[PDB]
Symmetry: C4
């Protein structure tokens, strides 16, 4: 349907999806750069990053944001999730598209507002996702794939709809999945599992080194997610030709 | 209405809001100062603050307190939240006012009971909020603004009332928002996102250096919250003139 | 009532309350002593205790145990909680009594099973609660009082019964209250807020130095809890003489 | 019943139970090895493992996985849990069996996919469970027994079915039980409380030193679990001969 305020609701989503991504990145990357703050106009040694601190920053950002606007847009805030839904035929490409853009832009916008907030920092990488020393790049992409997979998979089961056994908070569970991802990937690849988030940093930093692994890995994981839930473990009893109909509306 | 025990309930709130703030500050700042405790009448080096420990101390204090008296007063415990509700026209100024005072006083009272509990500590700052070395003050206030924003925004969506899709604990979600805030702001500004909490420490310590950023930043974030939820993402279909009516009762 | 299996249910509680305390202490103190394990028949320096690790160990033990047997006995596992209920006239002294004993014994039993598990440790204090260097003993008891207070208060509101606005898990909330307590008191007094738990260690270690503060402090906090919830913030509209009736059955 | 798609559902479980174990181990052991990553073709000192990071990695993996496929197979992902259910006569041996195999294999498969992901690591133990220096082996098995016990016990109470007082998320609670286990056992035995998980590492590493303690300990704890819940604290009013019937179907 493309009439009356069916226009409104839609744009409100895209917009909520756009504003929410700003808070997400600002808060999360904002938390990650916080350890570089022993600063006092000097330059002697440095502090050790806290992986729990960062993983919770990202995960709780999502739990909170999903709780704050999840009813308005579905609180995707991540192309790997959106793409996950799309292939599940639960969303329209018009949506996927407009959303993934609101996402990358919000990231780009947020990652760029931090540059000013934390300008006073040296080799300010702005939390750019980079293959860590010792991680066999490429084959080191099994990390992003599994990290995004488990996430998208959680999102599909949590919004399955045929279920009546869910208990507790959908947001919190999805958020903990997001923290679970970083508890796994922070060390290896700095954890991306979210194309728009990786993208936002690599642009405001013009560093796109291997940046491709942060799209192919999640988008793949999403693919494995939709394949495993929708066809192996929890299949719909309807035919493909009809699911596809969702592609338009 | 201003009759019968409509007086009682009201004062019970203010009071619960006042007592709850005491536990809040005592527990939280109480946790933050705990790392300074390697003490043994000596003075050699010192321990490194734990940001997860502190962020959870604050967040769980709220989750717990919101659970303990949230039904009695709404468990605001924070002018930025109260102010957030007020502008949303969900509360009366008589309330906002009496509450924000119960808040600052509880802080002031709590921050002052700790002085005795932890008197045996050196440069006892009593967890006073201070711009960290390297944070471009002022423009370093985007931290408090975002930190309080995301919080107040969560509180507005969580108590939206038109919703029937909330699942899990409202308290816990709000509490995690409060921990999310510190996971972001502890390093930069010591995290305030709560005027009364900052205020309580700066008074029992007579240090009001830049203390203004801890009111303008949250109160602003609250403003951005109410603007984004009430007018951009989740608008009420009623007119302003009628919402305003709430200003009195 | 004291007929039929009203005997059974009762004893099943006491017993569940007794068995659950064993797991509690074993797991929690078990976690706390774990950092002393760099051991290799040598004796060079030592590791720094993790306060989040310990606070979660205790809190999640409770969340889990309250979830596992909370329907059977109410999952008190703590004289300060039991005593809290008793004064609230929600339990019978026959219960309070039989329970507090199942508690101290379980502690005593558990604290004593660890002695063997961790015998290979040096100055094995078995997690005994001790006033930390720098904490003005006595006036340093405001810690246990606030720590137990906030806890018991959460338990009273969470089982209030007149409420229909609770959402999420009662166990988890109470558990997080228990973790909140340690995030506050670990540094100062090693955190007790639970007479039976302190007691269990001080007996298998014959160290009762100031051990009194771990009964007077919590039991007091409980008192402040029942006073604040039952008479100031959430009063019952019934008279005292009738509540007292509960003292017997 | 062994007709129609009663075959399908069954295999879908086994399979979901098999795929879910892969993500579990990959993510969790994946997180545990992450601290060994300061690597830069050098070899100077090393980082200190984070026990909260690891405990949450395991626990949230379960919370997430139980949420993702718990409706399909029950999300056991652990012989000690399965075995726990079996003895409770809530599952068929045909199930227990096919499941425990899907488990060990998934572990074996996962533990083997990491070998490649983290090949670039030195004495890559692949998170193999080993008795820590100072832990009186054997009598040091009280750890695995208690760790698995508390877990299985939580799973039995959480799926009790006669209950109508559960609140919140069953998955999250079980997940926190899994994190609780590691907060206790990581230091002592590297925490197993899950035969298939220990097994998976010891095979891809051909190190089976004491590996027996990781079966006898959990399987025992499970036994103590089913004994305590099903016969001491929460008994069914039916006779044994009829429960046994479940052994077949
Ligand atoms: C339904 C059948 C499911 C089978 C699942 C087993 C998949 C095994 C593939 O492992 C992959 O090996 C690559 C190197 O060859 C790595 O680069 C990659 O990161 C890793 O993931
Ligand atoms: C509707 C939002 C559209 C956002 C478009 C972003 C395009 C990419 C350029 O980003 C810019 O990067 C600069 C630093 O390099 C910042 O100083 C500047 O402020 C920021 O804008
Ligand atoms: C189905 C959705 C597909 C989305 C594809 C968008 C990928 C993002 C593009 O990254 C680009 O990579 C180039 C190197 O390859 C860089 O030179 C360029 O500056 C950078 O912007
Ligand atoms: C509906 C439109 C929403 C647009 C949101 C983008 C806002 C960009 C403003 O960034 C602000 O820049 C200041 C310096 O100029 C910083 O001091 C301040 O902390 C930072 O927040
Ligand atoms: C109904 C509660 C009213 C509280 C009013 C507080 C006013 C500010 C003064 O605080 C005082 O600071 C002293 C340390 O400087 C403490 O020694 C003293 O105990 C504390 O009271
Ligand atoms: C709409 C709500 C407005 C609340 C305004 C209260 C602000 C708190 C006042 O702080 C004051 O700042 C001064 C410096 O400017 C200090 O000299 C003074 O000692 C300190 O108390
Ligand atoms: C309804 C009125 C509530 C008033 C609450 C304020 C209580 C102030 C008491 O502080 C107490 O001061 C003692 C030293 O004098 C400390 O030893 C003790 O630990 C500390 O808690
Ligand atoms: C029904 C349970 C009753 C428990 C009574 C406990 C009384 C206190 C003595 O504890 C004992 O301490 C010894 C170490 O000092 C341990 O070696 C011994 O095993 C343990 O029993
Ligand atoms: C209303 C409930 C009251 C419970 C009271 C029980 C308190 C526990 C007793 O501790 C005792 O303290 C003595 C020193 O004072 C020690 O010498 C003795 O060995 C030790 O066992
Ligand atoms: C219903 C009655 C329940 C009684 C529970 C008390 C059990 C005491 C057994 O302790 C066990 O002692 C062994 C050494 O002898 C240790 O190797 C083992 O790890 C430890 O667990
Ligand atoms: C249906 C899944 C069946 C899995 C059977 C696993 C048998 C045990 C052998 O594991 C193998 O270990 C090698 C390293 O030693 C890996 O290089 C190889 O890839 C992996 O397969
Ligand atoms: C009721 C379920 C019983 C499951 C029993 C399976 C136990 C796993 C076998 O471990 C084996 O231990 C041997 C040493 O004893 C090793 O030599 C051998 O390589 C290793 O594979």
């Amino acid at each position: 349907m493309a009439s009356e305020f069916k226009k409104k609701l839609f744009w409100r989503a895209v917009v909520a999806e756009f504003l929410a991504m700003i808070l997400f990145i600002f808060i999360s990357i904002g938390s990650a750069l916080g350890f570089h703050y022993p600063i006092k106009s000097n330059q002697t040694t440095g502090a050790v990053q806290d992986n729990v601190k960062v993983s919770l920053a990202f995960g709780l950002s999502i739990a909170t944001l999903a709780q704050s606007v999840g009813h308005i847009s579905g609180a995707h805030l991540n192309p790997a999730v959106t793409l996950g839904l799309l292939l599940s035929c639960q969303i329209s490409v018009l949506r996927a598209i407009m959303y993934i853009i609101a996402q990358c832009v919000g990231a780009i916008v947020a990652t760029a507002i931090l540059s000013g907030i934390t300008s006073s920092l040296p080799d300010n990488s702005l939390g750019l996702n980079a293959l860590a020393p010792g991680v066999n790049s490429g084959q080191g992409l099994g990390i992003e794939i599994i990290g995004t997979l488990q996430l998208v998979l959680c999102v599909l089961a949590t919004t399955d709809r045929r279920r009546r056994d869910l208990g507790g908070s959908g947001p919190l569970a999805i958020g903990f999945s997001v923290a679970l991802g970083h508890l796994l990937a922070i060390d290896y690849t700095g954890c991306g599992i979210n194309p728009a988030r990786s993208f936002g940093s690599s642009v405001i930093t013009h560093n796109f080194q291997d940046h491709w692994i942060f799209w192919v890995g999640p988008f793949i994981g999403a693919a494995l997610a939709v394949l495993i839930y929708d066809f192996i473990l929890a299949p719909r009893s309807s035919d493909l030709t009809d699911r596809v109909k969702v592609w338009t509306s």
